[PDB]
């Protein structure tokens, strides 16, 4: 007698009043872990079109409590670790962003999604126990698009914006695995006479590890600015658990000190003045 959980995938961010069903999610990796956090089921679905009334069957066999972990748009940008049924556990590393040294592969134009379903339960069918069961899971986007401008700066082509974060590795549950920091590829436009703009696509932005935004004078290598992006943020208005796009302005000014060097004296994020210096 065959058994399983039907799962419906939605996206409702917490600031959203109605659930969404993002077209951005094109494929799925859905795992089932049991009472012990051991992998019991591993499934892959291509051609995903999330919908209000669409479901996906997650095969199970033995009665019990299960939680489902779901990943959207797992790509060949990622090094996938061991996945072994009856062995692999919830907190092992599923995934590492592919890197070249400490530089991330460029993931602009990609979305990455995670959901945890509630705990569900296959009950003894020999007694009063349904069919298959059903549940829903909320896909939260883990990718973040971060635009940064450094303003009022002579020779803006001589400066480089960098974004480091220890956020390229994830456990089976959606949590960030500990790792060395990862630099993300900052594609650049000198936009103004005194302005330089960089665009980063990074993964999850949360406290608990390095999330360093920095500005460096390339010819000398002199880092003129460094701050923890998440820290700056959580100093809102700017709620990381509902948002995924970050327009950041860094206002530079000559230091007036005997270093004849520039410094950052204002950091704006999504239109809020976060810190003056």
Author numbering: 40 to 274, 279 to 320
Reproduce text from the manuscript describing this model.
P. gingivalis displays two forms of fimbriae on its surface, FimA and Mfa1, both of which are crucial for attachment to other bacteria in the oral biofilm and to the host cells. In the work presented herein we have determined the crystal structures of the shaft protein Mfa1, in both mature and precursor forms, the anchor protein Mfa2 and a truncated precursor form of the tip protein, Mfa3. The resulting mature protein thereby has an empty position in the first β-sheet that a β-strand donated from another fimbrial protein presumably fills in order to polymerize the individual proteins into a polymeric fimbria.
The anchor protein Mfa2 does not contain any Rgp/Kgp processing sites and is in contrast to Mfa1 and Mfa3 considered to begin its mature sequence at the lipidated cysteine (Cys29) directly following the signal peptide. The full mature form, ranging from residues 29–324 was expressed, purified and crystallized. The final Mfa2 model consists of residues 40–320, and is built up from two β-sandwich domains (N- and C-domain) and measures 85 × 35 × 25 Å in size. Importantly, Mfa2 is stabilised by two disulphide bonds, a feature not present in Mfa1, Mfa3 or Mfa425. The first is formed between Cys54 and Cys285 and links the long β1β2-loop of the N-domain with a loop from the C-domain at the domain interface. The second disulphide is observed between Cys298 and Cys300, rigidifying the turn leading up to the penultimate and ultimate strands of the structure. In the regulatory protein Mfa2, the C-terminus forms a final β-strand that following a β-hairpin runs antiparallel to the preceding strand. Whereas the Trps in Mfa1 and Mfa3 are firmly anchored in similar pockets, the equivalent Trp of Mfa2 (W315) is solvent exposed, due to the bend between the two last β-strands.
